[PDB]
Write a protein that binds this ligand. Structure first.
Ligand code: ZN
Ligand code: ZN
Lengths: 770, 770, 249
C-alpha cells in the first residue's frame, strides 16, 4: 500500500491545499490513503487496508520516525533492494512486486534512500542506473554470451517515462503547449478526468512550476545554504504556482546555482536527493518534508498521465536523446548488453523534418560508437546524413556495440466524416510520407542498410490492414525489406482479432521471417478473455460480416463445428443483404470473392512504382466471371448506403461460438503463420490478474497453459510495457526468468533456455542487414 | 451498461446543478457514463464502453426516443422482463444479470414501465409485488408442496432497503438525524467520501427535499392537473432543495392531495409511476424527464449508501412493518410461500423498549394470522403481551400460514481504550440486556414458545466468541433453546477464521442441531481466497499466537504436515515468550492449557443463574498442576503491558502455509461440524467474479468444486445479500436453481433436489418450538 | 418421437405415397437437422438436392433457389394468411410489417405468397409422390429423434402419453423407452417430462387408475422390476402430472 503515500490524487490536493505550519495531518493522510485504495484497488476487502495502515504506522513509531518520504522510501528500500556483488539489486522473489510498484512510483527516490541509509561497500563508486535489477549468475552469463535483442520499442518515442518528467521541467512551457493542444480533444477529456478529476491545464502549469520551485528549494537546503529569507514568506504550497515569491514588496526569483551543467539531468536529480537525504538522516522540518510529499506526488501523477496517454516529441529531434538511448542500451561493461536494436520512429510529413530526424539518429549512433571504439572516422565532425554514412560504413559487425535497424511508424487514424472511400485522407497522408521516404532512399541509396522495414502501428479499429498492402509493396520495390503491422492487441471481439490477423497474413506482402506484432488475439484464451465484461458486445456491421466469412472459411474443414459454419454462412448472407441493400440472391461464395479483393487499391481502376498496383485491378477486371464481385466491392467502397450500414452497430452474444471453436480458429491461424514463417513480438503488458496468465506462456508451450492443438509460434521479445516506468528489454528478460522459475517451478536452466529461444529468435528474425 | 445511466453520482451532481432549460446534454451524459463506469466497473477495457454506448444511442435514435429514463426503462423491461403464466416473470437465462442489476438499481420504475408498455392479458388485475422472479414449473411445484425457510434475515432490521426509502420520505427529518448522528464517526466519513466524495449532511437534506418535491411535481403532471404556475418560476433543480418555492413574493408549497391515504407507500409509488409513464407514452417535457431522472438517481445513490452501511429502526417499533414483512413473506396464494420464518431483532437495553418491541412483533403476527384465518380470538383487540399470547395459544401448526421464531441479536463492539479486561464494558451491556430478557421471560414463561434461541451478530474482530459462553450458558439455564454465532464472515487471515470457528465450537455451549452462521472461512478455498491480497497479511499479535496454537494442535497428527506443526509450535513459543514477558520456559502444552481456559468468565474467581459460572473457576483452581496456566491467563486478561502487546500488530506471510495444509485445517473443522451436528447458514453475497464461484457449491459437492476430503455438514439457507435490493429467500432460491442448471448443466430435478436438501435442513434445524 | 423405426416397419409396403408439401418439408427438415452430424452429411446433401428439385417443381420455379431460401420460405408458415400478404388480432395482422420491411426477404416473401395462393402450386401440393420405406437408416432416424428430445428438454415441454396399433404386446410400448427401461431406451436419449393420459382408443371402462395398474403390472412381470422400482417409475410420470398441471395455483 506504501505506493499510495507516493501516488495519491486526493492526498495531492490535501497536501497542496493545507498550510505548511498546520502539523498533525495523520488522520487525513490515512483517510486519503483509504480513498486512494477505494479508487485504485477496489477489491481490497475494506479491512486489509485498516490493518496494513495500523502496521505501517506501528513500524514508523517503532523506528521512532515520522510519516514521511524518507520513512516510506526507507521501508521500501529495506524491503526490496539489496546490495550484492555489484551495485544495488532486487531480490528474485520480490522482483515482480517491485515491477508492480514501478507501475505506480518512481525509483530514483527509493534508490537514493537505499544508498544513503544502507550503502554497499565504499569501493565501487556507484553511478545512477535505471531500473534496478535482480541477480542470477546463469542469466548474467547468458546475456554476456549472447546479449539481448530489441524489436519492440514504440511505447513512448523510444525512452522511459522518467526522463520525460525531467524534460518537462526543462521545457515546462513546451509540455503545457502540448497539454493544451490536445485539451481540445475528446479522448483525453476522459483520460484526465479518470486519472485526476479536476486536473485542468492551469493546474497543469501550476503543478509543474510548483515542482520546479520545490526542487530548487530542496536543493538549496540539501546544499545547506542559508535557507533564504523569503522562505519565511513561503507559507502555502499554492504560492509555488508563480515564478516569483513576494516577501515584502519585492518579488524574489527562486532560480539558483547547481554544480552540474545539465541542471535537469537524472544524475543531477540523484546527487541532489542524496544530499538532501543525508542532511535529513536524523530528522526533518515538517514544511520541507511536506514539500517533498507534494514533489513526489506530482512526479507520479504526471508520469501516470503520460504513460496512460508531437512537439515534446519534436524536441527529441537532436542527437542527444538518441545517444542517451544508445548509451543506456549499452551496459556499464565494455560490451553492450543488447546486440541488435530496432529503432522505431514516427515519420513526418515534411522532407526537411525527416532529413533532420534521420541525421540526428544517425549522428547519435555514430557518437555512441565513437565513444566505444577508436578508428579513422574520415569526417571527424559529420554535418550531413551522407557524411554520417561515410563515417558508418567503416564499422564492422564485431558486436562490441549495438547494431541499429530503423523502422518508420505508420500511424492509423480514424476515418473522417467525408471522403470518397474510407480512410482516403489517411491514405493520402501515408502516401505522402512514404513517397518522401522513397525519395530519401533514392538520394542516399546507402540508407537501405539502416532504414530496414516499416511498421504499421496505432489503434487497429481505426484502419484495417488491407489499406497498407499497396504501401508495403511499393516500399518493398523501393528497397524496404521486412515489414511489421500491429494485430490482435485490441478488438471488439476475439474472433474479430483473429480474423484481422489472418487478413494481414493473407493480404500483406509478408515474406519469410517477417514479424507481425503483439497478436494477443491468438494468445489469449477464451477462458481468460471474458471475466468482467458484458454478455454481449456491440460492433460494426462490416466487422461482423468479415468475421462471419472468416468463421466460414476456417471451419469449412472442421467436422465438429459444421453447425457453426452453416450458421456463419446464413447470418453473413443476411448481413450482406442488409448492408448492401441487396434484393438478388447472393452466395457466400461471391461474398468470399468480394472479400478476397480487399488488398486492392481503392483508386486502381474502379475508382512510377505505383503503376503496378494501379493496374493490379486490370487482370481482375479481365477475369470475366467476376462481375458481381466487382460491382459489389465497388458498392462496398463508394456507396453511401453501404458505408452507413458498415458503420452501423449491433450486438454479438458472447457465446456465439464454443471456446473449443475459438481455439480451433486460433490453431488454424498458428498453422498458417508457421507455414509462412512469421514471428510475433510479445511485450509484457489488462485483464490478467497476475503476469502468470500472460499468453506468452501458452505460446511458449508451458504445461497447464498450452493447449493440445497447438504449435510453436516463433515469439520474439520487445521492451514495451504500457503501464510501467523505466522498463527495459533486460528487465522483461528477468521478469520472464523469475516467473518461470518461481510460479512454474522450472529449474534455472529450464527458465534460462525457455527465455533464450525467444531471445535468439529475436536475433534470427532481426531485420538488420546481414 | 445501462446501470450507469440509472445510478451515477457525478451525473447527479451536474444534472442537479445545471439549469432545467439547458437542453442538449448528450455529450455531457456520455462523459458522465464513462466516469461512472470507470469508477464502478474498472476492469472494462476502455472501448467496450464506447461500443456499448454507441449501440445504446443507435437504439434510442432508431426507435425515436430522447436519451432519458423513459427509453432506459423501456430497453430494460424489453431486455429483462416478460409476461408468463401469472404476472411478469424474468427470463431464466437473464436472472443473474438482473440480480446484478438490482445490486445497484431498483425495479419499481422498471416494472412500472413494463406494465405500462407491454401489459400482459388485461384480466389479472396487477397488484405490484416485489421482487420479480423467474418461472420454473418444478420450482413452483416444489415451493407449493413444501414451502421455504427463512433462517437468516438481519441485514436491514428485517426489511428490504427499498421500503426504507419511502420510510425516509415519510420522515425525512428522522433520516437526517440518523445521518448526522454517525456522520461524526470516522468510518461513515470514509464511506461517505468513497461513495459520494461531496456527500455531507447538508446536501443530504438538500437531495432528500429535492426528491420529495420532484415526487410532488411529477404527481401534478401524472394527475394531469393544470401544471401549477410556480413551475414557471422553478428553473433550477436546487430550487427544489427547499420546502417552498418563491414565485413572485409568494412562497408556494409543493404538497397536495394524493388519492391514497398512505402517501408514502410502494403501491402508491407504483400506481403513480404507471400513470406518469402512461401520460408520457409518446413524449414529454424535457425538464420533467430530467426531474424524474434526478429522482431516480438520488434514489439509487442513497439506497447504495444505506445498503453498504438506529432511530430509523426505532421508528419501526410499531406492529406495521412486521405485518408487512409477514404479508410479503406469504405469497399471493392462500398458502404462505414460507412455512417457517426466523425473526431476528436487537435486544434493547431498556426493559420498556424491549417489551414494546415484543408486543409489537406479537401483535403484528397475531393480526396477520387474523388476516388469513378465522376463529375465536378471545381478546378481539389485544393490548398486552399476555393478551397476544392468550390469542396465539389457540393457533395450530397446520401449515397454512407462517410460523415465527424470535431471536435476539448480540452486537459486539470494539474494546474501548480503558477497562479492567478487554471488552468488559461490552460484556456489561450484554449482561444488562440478558438480565432484561430473563426478566420478561420470568414474568411470562410462555414467551419461551416464541423466543427460540439467540444469535451473536456484528463484526467478528470486534470480540471473540469465548466471552459469550457464560452468557449463553446463563440464558440456556434460564430456558433459551438453540444458539447461533456468526463465524467465518470477515477475518484477518483464513487460518484465523478457521481458528475462530473451532474456538466457538469448543467453548460455546452448542448442542446437537444448533447452527453457526456464515462460516465462509471454511467454504472459501485457499486457491480463490488470495486474488488481489498483498503477498503478506497483517494481524494482531494475540490473533497470531492463537492461530499458531490452533495450527499445531490440528496438525499434530498429520504426518504430511508435521514440519508445519513443529514450526507453528516453535514460533508460538517465541511469541508467547515475547508477549507474556516470560523469562522461564513455557511449553506449547502449557499454552494449550492456558488457551483452553478462554471460555472462563473474567469476573468469576480470578478477577442466581450466574453463580454457576462464577464458581466454575473453583474446580480449575482446585486442580493442582494448573498453577502456571492460571497465572499466565491472569496476566493475559489483566496485565496492561500484556493487553498492549496483544493489541500491537505483527505481520504474517500470505503463503504462510501451503494451500493443501490450509484445506487440511478446513477439513479438521468439517469433521468437527459433522461430529457435533451443527448447521451452517450460507446466504448469497466480494472476491467472487461470478456467482458460480460461490463456496455454497463447494459444500453442495459440485464436481470440480468439492475437494477430495469434503464432508456434508447441514448447510441451511439465508435471505441476506449485502449488495442487492429487494432480495427474497425465494429469489435466492431461484438464483441457486438457475446457477446449478446452467453453469453446471444439471437437470431441473438435480438442481431442485440440490437446493432442497438445504431448504429441508432449514426445517430440520428450525428453532421454532415443537 | 416414441416409436422406434425397428418397430415401425413390420407390415408396411416398401414405398409410401404422400403429398408433395409433406415430402418437401420433410427433406427440408432432414437437412436442417443433418447439417451438423458428421456421420449423415451425405444424407443431408442428398436431401438438400432433392428438396431443391421438388421446390423447382412445386413452385414451377425457373430461376435457382437455394436450400437456405427454401428454409426462409418455410420458416414463415406461422404468419397469418390475411395479415399483410393476403383488436387483439391486430398484433398478428401487423407482424408481417417488420418482415416485409426486411429487404433481403424479397424472394422468400414472394415464394410464400405463391405457395399460399398459386392454384398450380396448390394442385402440386395435393399431388402425391412415393418414398422408399428405408429412405434413410435407423441411425439417422434416431439421431433426428434424439435431437427432438434435446429440444424437448431445452424448452421444458412435456409429452402426454396414454396407452393404445402395430405393437404385438404392451411390453413393446414406447412409453417404456421413454421411461428408460434397459433394452428399450436408446443411447442418445434424454429425459423429456412425460405425463399420463387415460385415453385408450380400443377399450371400454378405462380409467387413469386402470392404466396405472396396467403399467405397474407390465413393469413388474415383463421387466421383473421390484414393486418399489415399478412404483417409483410410474409415479415419475404420475406426479409429473402435478408438475405440469394446467390447473391454476
Ligand atoms: Zn505494439
Ligand atoms: Zn449474517
Amino acid at each position: 500500500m506504501e505506493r499510495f503515500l507516493l501516488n495519491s490524487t486526493v492526498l495531492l490536493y490535501r497536501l497542496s491545499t493545507v498550510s505548511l505550519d498546520e502539523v498533525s495531518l495523520d488522520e487525513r493522510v490515512e483517510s486519503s490513503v483509504f480513498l486512494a485504495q477505494y479508487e485504485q484497488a477496489r477489491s481490497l476487502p475494506d479491512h486489509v487496508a485498516k490493518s496494513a495502515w495500523s502496521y505501517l504506522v506501528q513500524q514508523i513509531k517503532q523506528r521512532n520516525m515520522k510519516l514521511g518520504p524518507v520513512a516510506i522510501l526507507r521501508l521500501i528500500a529495506e524491503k526490496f533492494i539489496k546490495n550484492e556483488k555489484g551495485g544495488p539489486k532486487i531480490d528474485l522473489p520480490m522482483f515482480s512486486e517491485w515491477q508492480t510498484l514501478m507501475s505506480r512510483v518512481s525509483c530514483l527516490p527509493i534508490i537514493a534512500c537505499h544508498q544513503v541509509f544502507n550503502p554497499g561497500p565504499a569501493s565501487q563508486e556507484y553511478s545512477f542506473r535505471w531500473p534496478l535489477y535482480p541477480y542470477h549468475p546463469t542469466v548474467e552469463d547468458y546475456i554476456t554470451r549472447e546479449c539481448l535483442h530489441e524489436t519492440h520499442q514504440h511505447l513512448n518515442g523510444s525512452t522511459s517515462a522518467e526522463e520525460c518528467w525531467l524534460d518537462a521541467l526543462k521545457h515546462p512551457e513546451a509540455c503545457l503547449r502540448d497539454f493544451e493542444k490536445g485539451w481540445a480533444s475528446q479522448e483525453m477529456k476522459q483520460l484526465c478526468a479518470q486519472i485526476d478529476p479536476s486536473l485542468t491545464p492551469r493546474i497543469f502549469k501550476d503543478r509543474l512550476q510548483i515542482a520546479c520551485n520545490i526542487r530548487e528549494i530542496l536543493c538549496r537546503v540539501a546544499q545547506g545554504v542559508e535557507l533564504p529569507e523569503w522562505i519565511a514568506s513561503m507559507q502555502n504550497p499554492q504560492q509555488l504556482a508563480n515564478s516569483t515569491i513576494l516577501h515584502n514588496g519585492r518579488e524574489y526569483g527562486f532560480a539558483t546555482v547547481w554544480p552540474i551543467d545539465d541542471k535537469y539531468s537524472q544524475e543531477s536529480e540523484f546527487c541532489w536527493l542524496t544530499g538532501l537525504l543525508e542532511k535529513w538522516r536524523f530528522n526533518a522540518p515538517e514544511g520541507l518534508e511536506r514539500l517533498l510529499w507534494i514533489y513526489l506526488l506530482i512526479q507520479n501523477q504526471y508520469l501516470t498521465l503520460l504513460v496512460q496517454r508531437t512537439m515534446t516529441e519534436l524536441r527529441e529531434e537532436t542527437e542527444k536523446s538518441y545517444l542517451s538511448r544508445f548509451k543506456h542500451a549499452h551496459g556499464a561493461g565494455v560490451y553492450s548488453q543488447v546486440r541488435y536494436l530496432e529503432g522505431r520512429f514516427a515519420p513526418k510529413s515534411d522532407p526537411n523534418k525527416m532529413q533532420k530526424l534521420l541525421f540526428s539518429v544517425l549522428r547519435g549512433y555514430w557518437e555512441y560508437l565513437s565513444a566505444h571504439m577508436s578508428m579513422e572516422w574520415v569526417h571527424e565532425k559529420p554535418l550531413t546524413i551522407s557524411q554520417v554514412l561515410d563515417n558508418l560504413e567503416l564499422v564492422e559487425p564485431h558486436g562490441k556495440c549495438v547494431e541499429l535497424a530503423l523502422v518508420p511508424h505508420f500511424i492509423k487514424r480514424k476515418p473522417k466524416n467525408g471522403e470518397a472511400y474510407p480512410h482516403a485522407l489517411l491514405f493520402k497522408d501515408l502516401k505522402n510520407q512514404a513517397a518522401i521516404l522513397m525519395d530519401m532512399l533514392k538520394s542516399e541509396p546507402r540508407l537501405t542498410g539502416w532504414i530496414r522495414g516499416v511498421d504499421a502501428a496505432a489503434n487497429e479499429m481505426h484502419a484495417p490492414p488491407e489499406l497498407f498492402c499497396p504501401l508495403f509493396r511499393v516500399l518493398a520495390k523501393s528497397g524496404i525489406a521486412h515489414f511489421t503491422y500491429h494485430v490482435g492487441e485490441d478488438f471488439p471481439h476475439l474472433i474479430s482479432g483473429i480474423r484481422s490477423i489472418d487478413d494481414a497474413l493473407r493480404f500483406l506482402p509478408l515474406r519469410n521471417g517477417d514479424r507481425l506484432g503483439h497478436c494477443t488475439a491468438i494468445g489469449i484464451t477464451p477462458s481468460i478473455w471474458k471475466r468482467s465484461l458484458p454478455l454481449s458486445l456491440s460492433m460494426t456491421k462490416e466487422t461482423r460480416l468479415l468475421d462471419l466469412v472468416f468463421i466460414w472459411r476456417e471451419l469449412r474443414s472442421h467436422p465438429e463445428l459444421l453447425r457453426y459454419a452453416s450458421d456463419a454462412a446464413i447470418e453473413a448472407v443476411r448481413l450482406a443483404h442488409k448492408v448492401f441493400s441487396l434484393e438478388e440472391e447472393v452466395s457466400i461464395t461471391t461474398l468470399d470473392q468480394v472479400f478476397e479483393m480487399r488488398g486492392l487499391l481503392a483508386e486502381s481502376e474502379g475508382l512510377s512504382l505505383w503503376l503496378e498496383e494501379y493496374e493490379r485491378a486490370r487482370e481482375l477486371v479481365k477475369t470475366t466471371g467476376m462481375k458481381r464481385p466487382l460491382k459489389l466491392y465497388k458498392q462496398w467502397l463508394t456507396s453511401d448506403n453501404v458505408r452507413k450500414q458498415r458503420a452501423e452497430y449491433v450486438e454479438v452474444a458472447l457465446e456465439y461460438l464454443p471456446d473449443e471453436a475459438v481455439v480451433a480458429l486460433q490453431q488454424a491461424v498458428m498453422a498458417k503463420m508457421a507455414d509462412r514463417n512469421i514471428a510475433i513480438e510479445c511485450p509484457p503488458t489488462s485483464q490478467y490478474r497476475n503476469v502468470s496468465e500472460h499468453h506468452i506462456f501458452r505460446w511458449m508451450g508451458l504445461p497447464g497453459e498450452a493447449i493440445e492443438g497447438d504449435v510453436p509460434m516463433s515469439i520474439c521479445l520487445g521492451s514495451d510495457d504500457p503501464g510501467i516506468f523505466a522498463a527495459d528489454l533486460k528487465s522483461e528478460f528477468y521478469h520472464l526468468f523469475v516467473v518461470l522459475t518461481r510460479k512454474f517451478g522450472l529449474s534455472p536452466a529450464d527458465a534460462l533456455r525457455k527465455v533464450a529461444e525467444v531471445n535468439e529468435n529475436g536475433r534470427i528474425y532481426r531485420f538488420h542487414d546481414v
